[PDB]
Design a protein around this ligand. Structure first.
Ligand SMILES: OC[C@H]1O[C@@H]2O[C@H]3[C@H](O)[C@@H](O)[C@@H](O[C@H]4[C@H](O)[C@@H](O)[C@@H](O[C@H]5[C@H](O)[C@@H](O)[C@@H](O[C@H]6[C@H](O)[C@@H](O)[C@@H](O[C@H]7[C@H](O)[C@@H](O)[C@@H](O[C@H]8[C@H](O)[C@@H](O)[C@@H](O[C@H]1[C@H](O)[C@H]2O)O[C@@H]8CO)O[C@@H]7CO)O[C@@H]6CO)O[C@@H]5CO)O[C@@H]4CO)O[C@@H]3CO
Ligand code: HEM
Ligand SMILES: C=C1CC[C@H](O)C/C1=C/C=C1\CCC[C@]2(C)[C@@H]([C@H](C)/C=C/[C@H](C)C(C)C)CC[C@@H]12
Length: 465
């Protein structure tokens, strides 16, 4: 029958278990998998859920049974936000196919498929490093600047332009949207999805989320209107124009899935997916480089050898920079920016390893448990970039590294994120030495959210050459 799992209280089930725990949810789930096995169940206030732990079960579900596990759960929060339309939380089906295909094609065509695109990223690193330089080595929080810089890469693809670092209205929208990604992980929202009548209560994190989402929605529709002003039909300049072309071609198809709503949802999703995740990867990398100056120095040694101290970083340099690549992958493995992926659901009744999983069951992919899977990793609890180097000193790709997930829903933005991570990291470490103020003791415990981000920390960036 159904997979077994820990017991919890009546009504609220394992929401109590997760909330009472001293461990963050993904850690709690990995430990429970040592007791009940690789696939176990949680009851989240009456919502029946299975958790997939370790490389093998995750791959068996997302890859071997790719169609069956490619759906999204109809949680009240998600139904309320996007009606299971758009792209990121779209039901597995025609609408998802339509939006996925459009987004994938737009990212190549308006983005990295064009010769001039990398130079637009480099211009962003220059805007970004110049802003860092203005602090003149005094301690500050990088979060805002990194967020601006990274969101701008996708802005180019979506809106056809970057926005300046004085655009406080755009930055405010992103701040509320990011708050929502964090609130989505709270006990308040787990309880809301279990007992949606809690919406009657006016105070709480659930009302903070709903209010933020209304503000963000309006802002996004106004950005999309402005980006469509000078549109030339069938000659799109960006994802918005391309979306509008699609709506025109499907005007007489009534089952066409493209819509004004779905444009706002899919745009919002593309914006927050990229901005939240890539930002946090860089924020974790900087923390660990300041923490471990010998590792920071090896990276800088390699930059100087390959790029030179004044040469412009290029994506083609990556294959000559194995240690830089090792460090970036080890930040992804170790820091787990998306620890529990995005929740899946079964699109039909499933059988996995003898256990029955009924249609619509929520499926949590514990990606953290894959990256700490001792069948595949030696001492996964240790941060060790050199685990990614082969006996000739070259970067070695590992099957059980899946920070972008696997299967049908695997990260659409992976290639772009990898370019951004590499070019921003190297441009930054080429120009500055990074360390903490007064060598101060920084906190490395992540915040609770749907992504893992560090607590606020100051860093001193000092010009090198
Ligand atoms: O006003 C009397 C009120 O009585 C009943 O409510 C009780 C409730 O059921 C209990 O749970 C408890 O409430 C405590 C609550 O659980 C705590 O979370 C807390 O609140 C903090 C929040 O955590 C934090 O988010 C923030 O609160 C902000 C809200 O999130 C935000 O939405 C906004 O709230 C405003 C609302 O937009 C607006 O509705 C208006 O509120 C009126 C209500 O519409 C109306 O129902 C009635 O409230 C009754 C209610 O019916 C009973 O269930 O009158 C309200 C007029 O005041 O205005 C809101 C105020 O801004 O802004 C807030 C900013 O605070 O911060 C708080 C910090 O405390 O503490 C609660 C302790 O009370 O008890 C209450 C009654 O005591
Ligand atoms: C370090 C950077 C990033 C990481 C680690 C990351 C990770 C992930 C993960 C784990 C998923 C879950 C897929 C699943 O459901 O199993 C995902 C989905 C997704 N990501 Fe990313 N991501 C990154 C950057 C980006 C960027 C920059 C964009 C867009 C500009 C993006 C767009 C998306 C979209 C649209 C989905 C949902 C796709 C679908 O449902 O079909 N991601 N990502
Ligand atoms: C799609 C939108 C934009 C317009 C409106 O505000 C409604 C809306 C909400 C989006 C949300 C709110 C809930 C939490 C969502 C679903 C996030 C979910 C939990 C996914 C998070 C993963 C980890 C991403 C960030 C990589 C992404 C989009 C967020």
């Amino acid at each position: 029958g159904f997979p077994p799992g820990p017991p919890g209280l009546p009504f609220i089930g394992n929401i109590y278990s997760l909330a009472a725990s001293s461990e963050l949810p993904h850690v709690y789930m990995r430990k429970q998998s040592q007791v009940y096995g690789e696939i176990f169940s949680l009851d989240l206030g009456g919502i029946s859920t299975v958790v997939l732990n370790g490389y093998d079960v995750v791959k068996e579900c997302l890859v071997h049974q790719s169609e069956i596990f490619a759906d999204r759960p109809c949680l009240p929060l998600f139904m309320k936000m996007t009606k299971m339309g758009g792209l990121l939380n779209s039901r597995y089906g025609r609408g998802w196919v339509d939006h996925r295909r459009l987004a994938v094609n737009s990212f190549r065509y308006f983005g990295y498929g064009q010769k001039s695109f990398e130079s637009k990223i480099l211009e962003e690193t220059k805007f970004f490093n110049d802003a860092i330089e203005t602090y003149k080595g005094r301690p500050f929080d990088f979060k805002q600047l990194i967020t601006n810089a990274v969101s701008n890469i996708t802005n180019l693809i979506i809106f056809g332009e970057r926005f300046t670092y004085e655009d406080t209205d755009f930055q405010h929208m992103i701040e509320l949207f990011s708050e929502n990604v964090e609130l989505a992980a709270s006990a308040s929202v787990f309880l809301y999805n279990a007992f949606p009548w809690i919406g009657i209560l006016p105070f709480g994190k659930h009302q903070q989320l709903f209010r933020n989402a209304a503000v963000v929605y309006d802002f996004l529709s106004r950005l999309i209107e402005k980006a469509s002003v000078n549109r030339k039909p069938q000659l799109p300049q960006h994802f918005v124009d391309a979306y509008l072309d699609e709506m025109d071609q499907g005007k007489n198809d009534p089952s066409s899935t493209f819509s004004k709503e779905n444009l706002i949802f899919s745009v919002g999703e593309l914006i927050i997916a990229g901005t939240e995740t890539t930002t946090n990867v860089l924020r974790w990398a900087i923390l660990f480089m300041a923490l471990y100056p010998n590792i920071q120095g090896q990276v800088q040694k390699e930059i100087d050898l390959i790029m030179g101290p004044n040469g412009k970083p290029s994506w083609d340099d990556k294959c000559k920079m194995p240690y830089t690549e090792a460090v970036l992958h080890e930040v992804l493995r170790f820091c787990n920016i998306v620890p529990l992926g995005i929740f899946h659901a079964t699109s039909e009744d499933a059988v996995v390893r003898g256990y029955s999983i009924p249609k619509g069951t929520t499926v949590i992919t514990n990606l953290y448990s894959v990256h700490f899977d001792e069948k595949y990793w030696r001492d996964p609890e240790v941060f060790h970039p050199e685990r990614f180097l082969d006996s000739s000193g070259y970067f070695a790709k590992k099957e059980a590294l899946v920070p972008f997930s696997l299967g049908r829903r695997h990260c659409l933005g992976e290639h772009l994120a990898r370019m951004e991570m590499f070019l921003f990291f190297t441009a930054l470490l080429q120009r500055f030495h990074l360390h903490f103020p007064h060598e101060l003791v920084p906190d490395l415990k992540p915040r609770l959210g749907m992504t893992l981000q560090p607590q606020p920390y100051l860093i001193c960036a000092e010009r090198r050459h």
